[PDB]
Design a protein around this ligand. Structure first.
Ligand SMILES: OC[C@H]1O[C@@H](O)[C@H](O)[C@@H](O)[C@@H]1O
Length: 340
């Protein structure tokens, strides 16, 4: 194999998502005969910065980095740039610095839009209960997923289709389509899962305890990713006054694919991590060759419109789980029971 002057930093092993990227990186690197070190940050911006400093000292020329905390990662990105290291922000955006060269990402606005659109497409009449949930505020993607969803849900709240049951801040904002970041942050504060299973389950339980029978029945749940969706679904499934629920997700985690098969989760947004990984490797290799990656479009990070290498996202339900996840080669059918 060849050692590449590239280092990969991922935020934590305690969010299942990053295990997918770890796996997919290792597979892609093995295929190409490349050796590249992967370090995890253990959900610590200080450790993340250390990781970057260690990689700089090992002589990396390109850093692929998914920040734990996007704004906090600014000094790490700046340290890399200061040592002549190119900075590819990966999946999540490093904020509040111009020390980001590229951003390899899925279309996160479209993830939230697709989540919300699924809920809308399955609701009729008026006064349908709507329960909102969000990611960690330290993740810029949590704001993007929420925005994408809000821009679909808000008109359907304003027109009486949905009634928000778990966020007074969202209710006070429900006739405003274009929320500021500070406004979104107030909603997210009330409905945050912190990308954590127990936190999500407990919040759903608290919400259900506060809610009355009139707020239940057939309900609509904006869950921001797969693990939090299962936690929330588990709470809602247990409430006898919830006669039916529709719940969203993303990442196509295996356990959620099984919930979808089994009728316990309604959908997931599939984000093909194989593409994200290859996009990052390709950009790194181009930079190592003193060439520019192929970026189209930008994401603003508070200081800079960062050139984007963006990949699409796809809604997966029972109707297309086989086409989207199995026929695509993402997963073996043998991973699941009773795949339609
Ligand atoms: O790990 C929590 C979440 O972090 C987000 O920034 C990633 O884009 C999601 O795929 C993941 O579910």
């Amino acid at each position: 194999t060849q050692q590449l002057a590239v280092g990969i930093v991922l935020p934590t092993k305690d969010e299942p998502r990053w295990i997918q990227d770890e796996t997919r990186f290792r597979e892609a690197l093995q295929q190409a005969g490349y050796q590249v070190e992967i370090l995890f940050s253990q959900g610590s911006s200080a450790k993340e910065k250390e990781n970057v400093e260690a990689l700089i000292a090992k002589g990396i020329k390109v850093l692929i980095i998914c920040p734990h905390d996007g704004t906090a990662a600014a000094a790490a990105a700046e340290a890399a740039r200061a040592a002549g290291v190119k900075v590819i922000s990966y999946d999540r955006l490093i904020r509040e610095t111009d020390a980001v060269d590229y951003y390899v990402t899925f279309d996160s606005i479209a993830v939230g839009a697709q989540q919300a659109q699924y809920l809308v497409d399955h609701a009729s009449g008026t006064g349908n209960p709507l329960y909102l949930y969000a990611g960690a505020a330290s993740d810029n993607n949590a704001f993007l997923f929420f925005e994408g969803a809000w821009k679909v849900l808000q008109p359907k709240i304003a027109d009486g289709t949905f009634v928000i049951k778990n966020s007074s801040e969202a209710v006070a904002l429900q006739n405003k389509l274009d929320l500021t970041r500070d406004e979104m942050a107030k909603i997210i504060g009330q409905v945050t899962t912190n990308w954590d299973f127990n936190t999500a389950k407990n919040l759903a339980e608290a919400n259900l305890t506060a809610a009355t029978a009139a707020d239940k029945g057939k309900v609509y749940i904006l869950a921001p990713n797969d693990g939090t969706a299962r936690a929330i679904a588990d709470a809602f499934a247990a409430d006898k006054d919830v006669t039916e629920y529709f719940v969203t997700g993303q990442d196509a985690e295996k356990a959620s694919v099984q919930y979808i098969i089994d009728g316990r989760q309604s959908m997931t947004v599939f984000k093909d991590v194989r593409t994200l990984v290859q996009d990052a490797i390709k950009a790194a290799v181009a930079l190592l060759q003193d060439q520019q990656p192929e970026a189209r479009g930008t994401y603003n990070n508070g200081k800079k419109d960062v050139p984007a290498i963006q990949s699409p996202v796809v809604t997966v339900t029972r109707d297309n789980v086989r086409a989207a996840l199995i026929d695509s080669g993402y997963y073996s059918a043998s991973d699941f029971t009773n795949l339609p």
